[PDB]
Design a protein around this ligand. Structure first.
Ligand SMILES: O=C(O)c1ccc(C(=O)OCCO)cc1
Ligand SMILES: [Ca+2]
Length: 258
């Protein structure tokens, strides 16, 4: 019925560990590409199926290894994930958006045969950490074909984005680098009221929560991508009528629940 549906019926427990697909990696060298610093592609293996694609950006000073756990996690749940390195560690959020744009184009047009065979290039999304999350919001404004955006503890000087791309923002309660009051919450509040949007705030979490295995980030990221990239309504249960003790805040216009 849903040709994009992958994997067994989800449980919260299954979404806090690597999923039902084996994962292969492909290293994209900085020299092989223009518009971004290369990175790592996590993609399903031991399968003939195709999956949606995600381009993901790390934050200021950081490299692709800072989101390796999440690239592998998503890939293992049935996604093709390119975690980029940036041209410079010190690139800002709009530069990161440009590099996500180049990464998506690369994934679609120039990625290895091994990756394209597993990729449905009609079904793409973006995610990013901190300045990477800022980049995610910018590219969401520019590219209306994207299925979803997930900014993780995002940072941007721009507080105002216009997109119809569904957005789930993860804030960290104890974030002193991109405080939720100045970044995540303004981004959420200033998105259009007609766009499906969710904001989740992790209790006691720091700016670096997204850089290490994290159950809540795994659940909300997989669930948002599954719902929008795969049209997978089985993931509504994790994003609707939410009563999660890991969270210290939750805001939504509940446009994703029906
Ligand atoms: O000091 C800052 O203003 C500042 C520092 C760092 C970042 C960022 O993207 O953080 C995560 C890096 O992995 C953003 C702003
Ligand atoms: Ca703006």
């Amino acid at each position: 019925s849903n040709p994009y549906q992958r994997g067994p019926n989800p449980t919260r427990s299954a979404l806090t560990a690597d999923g039902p697909f084996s994962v292969a990696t492909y290293t994209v060298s900085r020299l092989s590409v223009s518009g971004f610093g290369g990175g790592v592609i996590y993609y399903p293996t031991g399968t003939s199926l195709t999956f949606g694609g995600i381009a993901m950006s790390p934050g200021y000073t950081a490299d692709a290894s800072s989101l390796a756990w999440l690239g592998r996690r998503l890939a293992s749940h049935g996604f093709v994930v390119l975690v980029i390195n940036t041209n410079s560690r010190f690139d800002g959020p709009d530069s990161r958006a440009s590099q996500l744009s180049a990464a998506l184009n690369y994934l679609r047009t120039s990625s290895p045969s091994a990756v394209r065979a597993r990729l449905d290039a009609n079904r793409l999304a973006v995610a990013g950490h901190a300045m990477g999350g800022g980049g995610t919001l910018r590219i969401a404004e520019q590219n209306p074909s994207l299925k979803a955006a997930v900014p993780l503890t995002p940072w941007h000087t721009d507080k105002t984005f216009n997109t119809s791309v569904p957005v789930l923002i993860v804030g960290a309660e104890a974030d002193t680098v991109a405080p939720v009051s100045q970044h995540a919450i303004p981004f959420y509040q200033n998105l259009p009221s007609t766009t499906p949007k969710v904001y989740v705030e992790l209790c006691n979490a720091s700016h670096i929560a997204p850089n290490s295995n994290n159950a809540a980030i795994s659940v909300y990221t997989i669930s948002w991508m599954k719902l929008w990239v795969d049209n997978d309504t089985r993931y509504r249960q994790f994003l609707c009528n939410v009563n999660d003790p890991a969270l210290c805040d939750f805001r939504t216009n509940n446009r994703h629940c029906q």
